[PDB]
A paper describes a structure:
Several MR1-binding ligands are anchored within the A′ pocket of MR1 by forming a Schiff base covalent bond with the MR1-Lys43 residue, triggering MR1 egress to the cell surface. We describe a range of compounds found in CS that bind to MR1, and we detail the structural basis of their interactions, thereby revealing novel scaffolds that bind within the A′ pocket of MR1.
To understand the molecular basis for the binding and presentation of CS compounds to MR1, we determined crystal structures of MR1 presenting nicotinaldehyde, salicylaldehyde, veratraldehyde, or 2,3-dihydroxybenzaldehyde. Each of the four CS compounds was clearly visible within the A′ pocket of the MR1 antigen-binding cleft and each formed a Schiff base covalent bond with MR1-Lys43 in the pocket. The aromatic rings of each CS compound adopted a similar plane to that observed for Ac-6-FP; was wedged between MR1-Tyr7, Trp69, Tyr62, and Trp156 of the aromatic cradle of the MR1 pocket; and associated via van der Waals interactions. Each of these ligands was located at the base of the pocket and did not interact with the key MR1-Tyr152 residue. Here, the salicylaldehyde ligand did not exhibit further polar interactions within the pocket, yet the veratraldehyde formed an additional water-bridged H-bond with MR1-Arg9 and aromatic interactions with Arg9 and Arg94 at the base of the MR1 cleft. Notably, these four CS ligands, while making numerous contacts with MR1, did not contact the A-F7 MAIT TCR, suggesting that these ligands would not activate MAIT cells.
Author numbering:
A (entry chain D): 1 to 123, 131 to 176, 180 to 198
B (entry chain F): 1 to 99
C (entry chain C): 1 to 221, 224 to 246, 252 to 270
D (entry chain E): 4 to 203, 210 to 241
E (entry chain H): 2 to 245
F (entry chain G): 1 to 200
G (entry chain A): 0 to 189, 196 to 221, 224 to 269
H (entry chain B): 2 to 76, 80 to 97
Write the structure that this text describes.
């Protein structure tokens, strides 16, 4: 009966612009809400549209078209902080909410001087400092554990880096083999 | 401000003595909403009367329709009795006999 | 032709043992469609075809909303009294609704009264509230500070209400789109010595809206007007009278024109 | 809005009552559950004080609207299908198009057929590679929290006493140490970058069994606790 | 029949494009495009003397045309300037050169070209029932209708009496009243009058409606302001007959 | 450089006769047209003059003298509907149209029974404005702009109750000011001495 | 000043061979072409230099658009004529308009049409009517005469506008058109006498032969173009052996009489 | 339909060995389609010019066909619809 379709995941680049779409086939309409929900936190109110228009609070803007039946949420000058889920939901004729399944937005940092390398740490192998287009594969070995990547913003030096972590109970050369890495990767 | 009920008493069809019919009483235009209406046959209340629920008007007043099935005669005095806070004593209004 | 859908709310502070504190009632055309009040605390149909076509989940949802809406009205009227410094029993009233004309045009409206007199009149087209006095102005500032709620109503009156109405129009089309032509009749009598009165009386008809008048010779001419009344079976009845050149009662109903000439 | 508890381990068949309250003078209160890859789903709601009604997925639950302030949810006989993250929310009214929702922090419920697999994490700090502080003049600290069960952990980082946020990165979703088992424990890593100058204290809050829960087995009662590894 | 040009009204942002249709069903050969501005006569923008050619008139800069066939001659603004605020008429004649041949005009097009659309407003309309003093004194009843606060002047005010449009007894103001006559972006007020017999307005079942049609934005136009977007809309106000 | 000229506007009385001048300096001459353009409507063809003399067409007549560059347009027995704008246009030696700026004809109606009055109308439940009407006056009176920045006054209008064969004038004044009243809404205007001001 | 004339011609053909235009329109002052346009070029272009010199491109632009219209109006009229003649095949239709500035200051005016190079409609600007030669033309006459303004209009163009275009063009080509080049006339025997003029302009000249002081019975040659903007002509007479006669050639050209005795 | 009149003459009175222009003037024919060439001793001249078509008051058309030559003791062919075969007119000095 009532469907809410918004993309599952979206990825943009820090400083760029992304557009999350919410298309709604309800029965009756009394407004469309946009919520943000950080990682493991609560959803918080962002915006509301019921008439055709586009409202803008800050770097976030909410657009609604009653005729064709969609809304989008516009995010300008993307920052790492904007990584979140963006929940879109609509009130029907009886004022119930029909919720979207949400869209998880990923902000890929802009890496000035990529410096791919794999280090080894004593009381764990650390793949770090690669470009945002390399992709880690989940470890093939049953007792070798490899995480996905992680962006840290050293606010002080305005330096961002990615990082993956591998470990087992095997040396760091063999660690990220199932992952396809750059050929300028430093192995101490 | 208080609006006193307006009371209209009339038959469904053109009244003819000896011919069954219905007798409506159209209370309308009153504010506030607590009101007590009865219909009377020769001065005496009638046990069988249908009525409508309290109804609303764009002007913010209220109106009701009380009716009962009857057969008019030359002899019998039908009436509508109405009470409201605007009235010091209840008002009996007599049917005009389709005049 | 012209159809309508309205919802009324009435709230009485300090009621006597038999007047409930809250009433909510909705009408299509003349015919009441919904009921809830502060005593049974349930929203129920009042037309068979409302009940025939809407599932119970409808009445279960709108019962919950109406319970909540009553608690709004209770607090709202408490605050009104305090702006006026008013003890006693006073009334708060709301009417929202819309119209869809034969003419394809639409209106929508939303107003509040307190003690039976106009208090706040919405203008969906300007999206502001006309306030009757210094107290109504205070609520006019609160309401006008929520930019989003004014768009919301504007849309509800212009889009939601109309769609509800057409839904309810199809539901009971066998009652509200029907037409009962009138039986019209001219009665002449001499009342006060020398004074003849002609009464043109119409009855038996539906919808209620009828057009009756008197003309002399073919052009227009003081006319006492009787109110359109419900006969009881749900047809209506009315009349126009004058006294006394040829004379003729003209009646127009549901597009059909009829002329009764007095001999 | 305020809601308690943030996390709870539950044995199948136990009953549980989740609590919520707001001093916003709000009239409507709602109870949602958030499950992976699908909308928020309403369980029960309270349009205003004095009424309550079911929502979308009511079975297994009920609700009481104690007053205008508080509104509580109750699991009668906890099922594995009720493992979820629960949300309480209030709006000023209901039936006003514009009024949004105000949400509580969340409640993570884990229903298990037997508590005999609950384990606090093991924590350890890993000291930066000297090929890092030289190649890049930057020291990555890694923190690893392994073999804990269920996924009820909250890692955080602490430098010279104050909790830090810059230079920290923690994995979004923990990883299954035994992905073939339907009851695998989890691992979770974090990083912390700093100058070689500043280079020359991790922490995991874990939520588990209460003191009130029965513990019979050999090993220590795996209660809610904090595990720390420090580095200097 | 005759010459049909569209649209009748259009508000445009500085920098916008626009194409104005014009068709003729009389089998003419000549077709024209005139623009009309206060104080000056009809100036020709482009013309098309026959089916297969066009050429510049007095003032073609800002415009270009196209004669797609013998019946249609459409005028295109490409980037729109506030000095192109004008009323545009399309005309036609059987032939050019014919010294006695007359021009056949279409209905016209009022284009208004604004820097931004944040002063575009639809009207507030308000009916005002007759003065009883008037009715006792003249036995006539005059209703006044007021459309206020709109911008630009793209409006059509009519009176509807019992679901049918009337024209007798109606008087609508020729030109609008600038509400603030000095400010150049100022909004407009218009007034109108229906005068019926006193015995007409004293029938209780006689319905009146003062209606103003307002041409403004549409689905295409970017709206970014907080208030309601002033789309093309019809704004009414009603009064009912009154016997007492 | 060519130039055609004609008066901006003229004003006469219903029933009387009006003569509309048009003087042109053109490069050649192939004919002189007249166009009537009703306010907000499209221009329409009135007449054609290419040789000297005068030429009648029903109520209207248009004359030309090439020797003096002059054509006038004559409308006899003025009806209210002859209230339009009248434009003169000349075809030049290259058969191009040169248009005058237009002459605006304004017809003061013939009001047989003057009864000037100022009526307060019935306030709306959806406006703050009060609306004063100044009606039933002879066409000789001037209605002026409001001196007060918050009173608004529209120029005089002639309506026609066609069924009652009755014409009248009307100027409307409205405002949301508290003080505003009909007894002061037209102090800006020289109104008749005998204007009706009903008691409020 | 002598008799100058401005004429505009127009031709149409119904089924032209793929090369030939279906519409040509040439204007003249006297013998001198001044303008041309045709269905192929679709541009109206000066055909004399003192036209191009003196008239800015705005003029040619304007009249090109116009003739593109007149071209098609002519295909209309000719298609109508052939339909009613019930004529198959290829047929011609021609228009010619213009005035004449006479020596004395008085003027003229003319306008007409032909079908297959034979008169069809001849305008009479003083009765303001049209002369039909057959009933196809009569149909056309009844239409154009109904349009009284279009007869009035043509009169005023012929009597005022044409004369003023003529006066302007005669200025522009002052040198070509207001110049006299006297003829060179010689007699010789062929047995016939032959008077022969050449080298003169304007082309308008008068040659005859007198037999003892009476204009004889003369064969006249034509006034022909030489190619260099001048003209040539001749008139022969046959000789009577059986009696003697004095013979003389008389040549009048541009206000100057010549006599060649034999 | 009118057969053309064809006339072959010289621009100036020719002396042998003295340069001149050979003119062929075709005139008074109708309709407007017509071929013209000048002929030197049987063969057609190549560099042979002509003026644009032209209009008489009597609706007929004319054309001048010319060529630059020098006549010698030793040293026009028009065709139309109106003629069966091309008619030839020769220059008689």
């Amino acid at each position: 009966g009532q469907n809410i379709d918004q993309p599952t995941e979206m990825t943009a680049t820090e400083g760029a612009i992304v557009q999350i779409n919410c298309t709604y086939q309800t029965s009756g309409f009394n407004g469309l809400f946009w919520y943000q929900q950080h990682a493991g936190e609560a959803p918080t109110f962002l915006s509301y549209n019921v008439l055709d228009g586009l409202e803008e609070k800050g770097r976030f803007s909410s657009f609604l078209s009653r005729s064709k039946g969609y809304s989008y949420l516009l995010l300008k000058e993307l920052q790492m902080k904007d990584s979140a889920s963006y929940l879109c939901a609509v009130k029907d004729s009886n004022y119930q909410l029909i919720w979207g399944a949400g869209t998880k937005l990923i902000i890929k940092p802009d890496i000035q001087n990529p410096d791919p390398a794999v280090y080894q740490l004593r009381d764990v192998c650390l793949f770090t400092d690669f470009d945002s287009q390399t992709n880690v594969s989940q470890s093939k070995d049953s007792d070798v554990y490899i995480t996905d990547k992680c962006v840290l913003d050293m606010r002080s030096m305005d330096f961002k880096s990615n990082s993956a972590v591998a470990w087992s109970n095997f040396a760091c050369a063999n660690a990220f083999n199932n992952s396809i890495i750059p050929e300028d990767t430093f192995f101490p | 401000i208080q609006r006193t009920p307006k009371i209209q008493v009339y038959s469904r069809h053109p009244a003819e003595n000896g011919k069954s019919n219905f007798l409506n009483c159209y209370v309308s235009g009153f504010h506030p909403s607590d009101i007590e209406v009865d219909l009377l046959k020769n001065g005496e209340r009638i046990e069988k009367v249908e009525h409508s629920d309290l109804s609303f008007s764009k002007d913010w007043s209220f109106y009701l329709l009380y009716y009962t099935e009857f057969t008019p005669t030359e002899k019998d005095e039908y009436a509508c009795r109405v009470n409201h806070v605007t009235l010091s004593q209840p008002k009996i209004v007599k049917w005009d006999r389709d005049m | 032709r012209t159809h309508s859908l309205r919802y009324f709310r009435l709230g009485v502070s300090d009621p006597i043992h038999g007047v409930p504190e809250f009433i909510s009632v909705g009408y299509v055309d003349s015919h009441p469609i919904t009921t809830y009040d502060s005593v049974t605390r349930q929203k129920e149909p009042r037309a068979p075809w409302m009940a025939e076509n809407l599932a119970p989940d409808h009445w279960e949802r709108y019962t919950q909303l109406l319970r909540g809406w009553q608690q709004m009205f209770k607090v709202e009227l408490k605050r009104l009294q305090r702006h006026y410094n008013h003890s006693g029993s006073h009334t708060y009233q709301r009417m929202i609704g819309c119209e869809l004309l034969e003419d394809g045009s639409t209106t929508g409206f939303l107003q509040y009264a307190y003690d039976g007199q106009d208090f706040l009149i919405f203008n969906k087209d300007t999206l502001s509230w006309l306030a009757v006095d210094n107290v109504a102005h205070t609520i006019k500032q609160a309401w006008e500070a929520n930019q989003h709620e004014l768009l919301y109503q504007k849309n509800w009156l212009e889009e939601e209400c109309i769609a509800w109405l057409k839904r309810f129009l199809e539901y009971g089309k066998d009652t509200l789109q029907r037409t009962e032509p009138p039986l019209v009749r001219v009665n002449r009598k001499e009342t006060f010595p020398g004074v003849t009165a002609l009464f043109c009386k119409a009855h038996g008809f539906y919808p209620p809206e009828i057009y009756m008048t008197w003309m002399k010779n073919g052009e227009e001419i003081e006319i006492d007007y009787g109110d359109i009344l419900p006969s009881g079976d749900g047809t209506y009845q009315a009349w126009a009278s004058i006294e006394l050149n040829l004379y003729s009662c003209h009646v127009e109903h549901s597009g059909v024109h009829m002329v009764l000439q007095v001999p | 809005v305020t809601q308690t508890p943030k996390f709870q381990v539950l044995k199948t068949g136990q009953s549980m009552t989740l609590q919520c309250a707001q001093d916003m003078n709000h009239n409507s209160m709602y109870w949602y559950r958030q499950d992976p890859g699908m909308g928020l789903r309403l369980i029960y709601y309270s349009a205003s004080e004095g009424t309550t009604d079911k929502g979308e997925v009511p079975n297994g639950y009920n609700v009481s609207r104690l007053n205008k302030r508080e509104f509580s949810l109750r699991l009668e006989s906890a099922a594995p299908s009720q493992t979820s993250v629960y949300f309480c929310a209030s709006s000023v009214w209901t039936g006003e198009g514009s009024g949004e929702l105000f949400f509580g922090e969340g409640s993570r419920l884990t229903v298990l057929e037997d508590l005999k697999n609950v384990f606090p994490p093991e924590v350890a700090v890993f000291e930066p590679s000297e090929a890092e502080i030289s190649h890049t003049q930057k020291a990555t600290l890694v923190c690893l929290a392994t073999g804990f069960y269920p996924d009820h952990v909250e890692l955080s980082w602490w430098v010279n006493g104050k909790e830090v946020h810059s230079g920290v990165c923690t994995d979004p979703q923990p990883l299954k140490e035994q992905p073939a088992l339907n009851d695998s424990r989890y691992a979770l890593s974090s990083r912390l970058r700093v100058s070689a100058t500043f280079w020359q204290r991790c922490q995991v809050q874990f939520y588990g069994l209460s003191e009130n829960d029965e513990w019979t087995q050999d090993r220590a009662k795996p209660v809610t606790q904090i595990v720390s590894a420090e580095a200097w």
